[PDB]
Amino acid sequence: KYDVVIVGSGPIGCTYARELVGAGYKVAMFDIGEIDSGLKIGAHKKNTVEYQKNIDKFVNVIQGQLMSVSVPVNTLVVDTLSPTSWQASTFFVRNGSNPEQDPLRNLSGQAVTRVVGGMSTHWTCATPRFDREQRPLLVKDDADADDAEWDRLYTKAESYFQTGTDQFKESIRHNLVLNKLTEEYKGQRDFQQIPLAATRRSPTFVEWSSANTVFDLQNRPNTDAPEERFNLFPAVACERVVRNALNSEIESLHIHDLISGDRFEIKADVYVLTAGAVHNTQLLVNSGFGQLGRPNPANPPELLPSLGSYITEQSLVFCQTVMSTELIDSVKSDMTIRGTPGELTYSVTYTPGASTNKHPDWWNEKVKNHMMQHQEDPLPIPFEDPEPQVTTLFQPSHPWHTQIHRDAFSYGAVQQSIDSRLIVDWRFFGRTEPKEENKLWFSDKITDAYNMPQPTFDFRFPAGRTSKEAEDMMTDMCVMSAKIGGFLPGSWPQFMKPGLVLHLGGTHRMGFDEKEDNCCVNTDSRVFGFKNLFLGGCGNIPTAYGANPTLTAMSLAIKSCEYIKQNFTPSPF
Amino acid sequence: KYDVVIVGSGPIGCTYARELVGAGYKVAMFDIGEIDSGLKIGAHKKNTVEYQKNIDKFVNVIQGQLMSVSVPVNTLVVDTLSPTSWQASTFFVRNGSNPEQDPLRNLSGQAVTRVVGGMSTHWTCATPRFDREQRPLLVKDDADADDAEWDRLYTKAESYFQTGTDQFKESIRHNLVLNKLTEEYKGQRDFQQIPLAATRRSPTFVEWSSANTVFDLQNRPNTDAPEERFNLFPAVACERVVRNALNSEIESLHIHDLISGDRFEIKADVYVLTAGAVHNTQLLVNSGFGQLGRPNPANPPELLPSLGSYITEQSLVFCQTVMSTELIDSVKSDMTIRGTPGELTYSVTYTPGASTNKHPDWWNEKVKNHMMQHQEDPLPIPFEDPEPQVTTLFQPSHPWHTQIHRDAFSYGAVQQSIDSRLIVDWRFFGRTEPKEENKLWFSDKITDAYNMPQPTFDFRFPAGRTSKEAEDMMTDMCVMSAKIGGFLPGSWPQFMKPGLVLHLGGTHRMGFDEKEDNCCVNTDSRVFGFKNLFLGGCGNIPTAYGANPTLTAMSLAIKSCEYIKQNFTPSPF
Amino acid sequence: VDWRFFGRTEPKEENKLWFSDKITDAYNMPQPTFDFRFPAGRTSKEAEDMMTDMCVMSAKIGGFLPGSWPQFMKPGLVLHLGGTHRMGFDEKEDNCCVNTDSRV
Amino acid sequence: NVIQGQLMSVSVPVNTLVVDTLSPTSWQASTFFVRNGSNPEQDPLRNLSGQA
Numbered sequence A, B: 001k002y003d004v005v006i007v008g009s010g011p012i013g014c015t016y017a018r019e020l021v022g023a024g025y026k027v028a029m030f031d032i033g034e035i036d037s038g039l040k041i042g043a044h045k046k047n048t049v050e051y052q053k054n055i056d057k058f059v060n061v062i063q064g065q066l067m068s069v070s071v072p073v074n075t076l077v078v079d080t081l082s083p084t085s086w087q088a089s090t091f092f093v094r095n096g097s098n099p100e101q102d103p104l105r106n107l108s109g110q111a112v113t114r115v116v117g118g119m120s121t122h123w124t125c126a127t128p129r130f131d132r133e134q135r136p137l138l139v140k141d142d143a144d145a146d147d148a149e150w151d152r153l154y155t156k157a158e159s160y161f162q163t164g165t166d167q168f169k170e171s172i173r174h175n176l177v178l179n180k181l182t183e184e185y186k187g188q189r190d191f192q193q194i195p196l197a198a199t200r201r202s203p204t205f206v207e208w209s210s211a212n213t214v215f216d217l218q219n220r221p222n223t224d225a226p227e228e229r230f231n232l233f234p235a236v237a238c239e240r241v242v243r244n245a246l247n248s249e250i251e252s253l254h255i256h257d258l259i260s261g262d263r264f265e266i267k268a269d270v271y272v273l274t275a276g277a278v279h280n281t282q283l284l285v286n287s288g289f290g291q292l293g294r295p296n297p298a299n300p301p302e303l304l305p306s307l308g309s310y311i312t313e314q315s316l317v318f319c320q321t322v323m324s325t326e327l328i329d330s331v332k333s334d335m336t337i338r339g340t341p342g343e344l345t346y347s348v349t350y351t352p353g354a355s356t357n358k359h360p361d362w363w364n365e366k367v368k369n370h371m372m373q374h375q376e377d378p379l380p381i382p383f384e385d386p387e388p389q390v391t392t393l394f395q396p397s398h399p400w401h402t403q404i405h406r407d408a409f410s411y412g413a414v415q416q417s418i419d420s421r422l423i424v425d426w427r428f429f430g431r432t433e434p435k436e437e438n439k440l441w442f443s444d445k446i447t448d449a450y451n452m453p454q455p456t457f458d459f460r461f462p463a464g465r466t467s468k469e470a471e472d473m474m475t476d477m478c479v480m481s482a483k484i485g486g487f488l489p490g491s492w493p494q495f496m497k498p499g500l501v502l503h504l505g506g507t508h509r510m511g512f513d514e515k516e517d518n519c520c521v522n523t524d525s526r527v528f529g530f531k532n533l534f535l536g537g538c539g540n541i542p543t544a545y546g547a548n549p550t551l552t553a554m555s556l557a558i559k560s561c562e563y564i565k566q567n568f569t570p571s572p573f
Numbered sequence C: 001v002d003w004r005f006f007g008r009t010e011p012k013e014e015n016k017l018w019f020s021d022k023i024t025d026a027y028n029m030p031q032p033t034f035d036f037r038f039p040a041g042r043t044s045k046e047a048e049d050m051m052t053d054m055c056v057m058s059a060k061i062g063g064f065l066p067g068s069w070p071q072f073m074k075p076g077l078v079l080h081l082g083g084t085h086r087m088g089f090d091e092k093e094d095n096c097c098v099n100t101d102s103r104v
Numbered sequence D: 001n002v003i004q005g006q007l008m009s010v011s012v013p014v015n016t017l018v019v020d021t022l023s024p025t026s027w028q029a030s031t032f033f034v035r036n037g038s039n040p041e042q043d044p045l046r047n048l049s050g051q052a
């Protein structure tokens, strides 16, 4: 018996834990995944010296914990086999494919992570706020009151994640890119550093935030928190919540310990589901919400008929660029260079503090010393200079999120020929209109690897504004990126596979009125009709958004926990 | 001050810890890497439910912790850049390349892992013994005595790693492949299961051994070992051992804590280096053994002139096959099949226990039930049937090691069209003659990512028998694999990049006499001349070997620890 | 639909086609060798403006075909090499090889 | 195919790509020598590589 049980140990489940453990509730948390980020439980995997030394190897870490949600049956012909090799006469269901999945209505890049800390053990840590256009309402008919509520929630979410905009302020590359863009879009768009959930520890080490930053996941009471109560139970599959008859309360949570094989029911006052946008939906379906099997509006579900409908995923366009000659030469614009590099006469000098210099002294010292000490190196940028982290945030005249940066990436052998200091990544994210016909549903015949109902998508990007804006966004990336450099071969402007972005929203969406707003939870993230059932995560977000959603989802989790504190009493310790 | 200090927390360093902590020595162990395998410190990363469900994702784990030792300067031309993009006029030293490295004398696949548990957190766990031809001598001029010593050491090493040959005995695929090969090579070669360091826990879960199996790496004393003494210090770079003047003793170990930045000297009675074949050599060079800079026999080193010479790496050939029609049909040879699958009349039956059946009842029940219950599936092999794990061990008439199995592999989209149950991997490993001219040396100008002397190879596969045998081995794989099926397109028989095998040996090689056997350590793994310095690992192996070397290296570590117990007294507790 | 946009290249003295005095081609004639880079300044800026223009214009018709994303082609693949024996009015003042009758 | 079959490259630089998955029995040079019709006068970084 617990006061509060939380399904899922990602950053949203950890927000509930931080708030509710700190308030004195006796809290249990279950995760189907295991502890495997080191002794700091749920911490960011990128915070080892070895990954900080070799960022690009990190793409392997990410890929190794992303499992595809729904893979269609493969129909590719292989006809260069030996005649002795056994072959079927049809393209049969094999290799883990979902036979319910129409390949032409899929989110083929959608994937899930089952580990303690969830996806926050590998995420990019970008934590922008949503502007009004992207953001669900918390106060109706009073925009100033609505803004005030969001500001308070986002401010607390930013403190939990240690969001900052200063960790890259003395990078030459960052400031090179940022300066050019600020100048090019003067009077039209504003640029800043991407808000990142991270703390710089040294000039070459950044401690990336994670679920662990929000809540350390250590069992309590302990010497450090002797009056708190928390237990974490990894390798436990939460299967089903038991509804009462009137669908007004949850009575227990059915769990399956994957190590012992034992199956139990756990009792709690408050049940919080934070298993992610796919797996929250799965657990609800398995508990008798919505409908199992292929959707059939002939007869909509009685319980939460909007569950799994109005799903949204962002469009994502990508390229990389190789920095222009104009910009590289500008790095060293304040220098007087004489002689020929490597020969007796070579020198590089500048006049500190001169009013006509284009750069600050900190920049010019770094450049000068790099050029003088490394004459074998033809670039003016220090070897260990951090990467750009630049954005122009979503606005009505440019309704997409932008990241102009470097993230872990697997470079091919041709691309490895280009010096890394030249390369900048461009990721532009579009907003997707929520449409009733875009669904996540669960098979009544096929099961997934954990023997739960197999998720299946029926998705297409909506016609109309979403689609038009996706193309305007592609064009905008092409236009903007040209100010910095030309494209890197092999990383020409392209759309990525749908869902590869991992910002799936709207699967258990929020609104004011269940019927009128076609939604599953109210603004306290409480499931309609249920006194003690709360859902957290991006699945709650009912709007068309382009920015990265986790901070927003954390903010809605905070509000949800304020409701729980107003309505449920902790047990005596 | 410690009785014993161990540099490196892989399985060889853990062998020293297990032996010496258990004998009552006060032991410290340092690893440059971090704890990141979960709460069981140094455990196998593949032992999560999630990897057991999705083996192929594990290749990402491996790749994410393999860092290339020496990468030459890239000279590939990219000429489809935009004219605005900055480009150098030469192929300059960039992107981490080693300018000392001749691309045509490299081991381009050689890589290192810096993590607590070392490479044993991702290894394949194959632990064969070496036969006399491959194995260094421990007793001169008495082959029976020599065999007896190796048998005792291997038996203890097998118990430490939990080596077994029974974990795949009821797999249909394993027995299908094994049976065919046993029959095809009757009277010529013997086949068995690959000896694997692993314990089966259920029909779908195998607990793969690791450094943690050998020693749990927990600090001691603790409730469970209240009279033992052990401390593990991760994120500590060991830089140098301090020699006395006479080169008869080590006086201290210089360390650098990578988190605090502090640099200390640690005192011990016994110093053991188990940092791997590359990094042991690096640490010795940094400590004044051998020679820094490009080798120059004009003046050989005074101290350990054979260090870093006579290096050996195995040749490795690879393919995959798609199982033959003959073999797939043989699975169901005992069945009477009537009707058409999916139709009312379909049935599959057999006669249990009949003397004319080709398979045991356990096999036929599995097949029959699979065929009847899954009529949409055209194959007779159960979905969760384990993979083959088959070998014919090195012999003078086939002087290569063989693994005929499945390991984690990244399948392309065409290859994903072939049902996984059809696919078998073939890895054949050749032996490489030790030659003086094959060297690992360390730059006196360029440093690696941890600011230690940059490793550089001067390697080519020797002419003569090694090379001839590499081709005979390629032919043998082609011949043998054809008995099982034809090649899988994209996985046609091929040599892999040199060093990708990761069985680098001979860098600090063992023998009886330093001069006459051109070696660095004696048969107690004691560095010649030094009373208290021991090296462990594959670097000790002085022979041409084809089998996987870790069990052999563990065996030599055991012998080394028996010497330490005979010669050094533990401190009072 | 295919989109091919072709830019103009400023003639620069330093961009040369020359012929080896040591190496011969397949017909045993002096081997052609280039010393070429796209000029700095307007040519190069316009090449990027042109890339942008193709991206903008093409979006009015449809999205890109995977595998045929906007890209520069290898230099010279266009086969519109000019200026190797160039025309002008005055040999010296116009740095040229033939007059307006194409007479050397 | 018709086009490609009658376009002959004007000036091809010396190839320096490393192939290191050959068999140990196969003959290999220790340098990237002038071969396969390459023009040793041609700096790969000042070429018109598509000219034909």
Ligand SMILES: *Cc1cc2c(cc1C)nc1c(=O)[nH]c(=O)nc-1n2C[C@H](O)[C@H](O)[C@H](O)COP(=O)(O)OP(=O)(O)OC[C@H]1O[C@@H](n2cnc3c(N)ncnc32)[C@H](O)[C@@H]1O
Binding pocket: A007, A008, A009, A010, A011, A012, A013, A030, A031, A032, A033, A062, A113, A114, A115, A116, A117, A118, A119, A120, A122, A123, A124, A125, A126, A127, A236, A237, A238, A239, A274, A275, A276, A277, A279, A283, A502, A536, A537, A538, A548, A549, A550, A551
């Ligand atoms: C993968 C990734 C994600 C990502 C990112 C880059 C990549 C490569 N970049 C981001 C960024 O720059 N900014 C941002 O806002 N988000 C970014 N993301 C996405 C972000 O990681 C996710 O939005 C976030 O982690 C979602 O948090 P939430 O806590 O809701 O969910 P989760 O992390 O997926 O964790 C859920 C857990 O629940 C478990 N689980 C699942 N099913 C069950 C059942 N049945 N029973 C018990 N536990 C369950 C999982 O194992 C998991 O840990």
Ligand SMILES: *Cc1cc2c(cc1C)nc1c(=O)[nH]c(=O)nc-1n2C[C@H](O)[C@H](O)[C@H](O)COP(=O)(O)OP(=O)(O)OC[C@H]1O[C@@H](n2cnc3c(N)ncnc32)[C@H](O)[C@@H]1O
Binding pocket: B007, B008, B009, B010, B011, B012, B013, B030, B031, B032, B033, B062, B113, B114, B115, B116, B117, B118, B119, B120, B122, B123, B124, B125, B126, B127, B236, B237, B238, B239, B274, B275, B276, B277, B279, B283, B502, B536, B537, B538, B548, B549, B550, B551
């Ligand atoms: C990677 C791998 C290896 C492998 C394998 C498959 C792959 C993909 N398959 C194997 C198999 O089937 N059978 C077998 O016998 N071996 C197989 N291997 C190789 C095996 O993992 C290695 O032979 C073995 O792990 C070697 O053990 P050893 O203990 O000698 O070395 P290590 O595991 O590399 O660990 C050494 C550690 O030392 C640290 N270190 C390095 N430098 C320093 C310094 N300067 N200071 C402090 N510590 C240092 C490392 O961080 C490391 O953990």
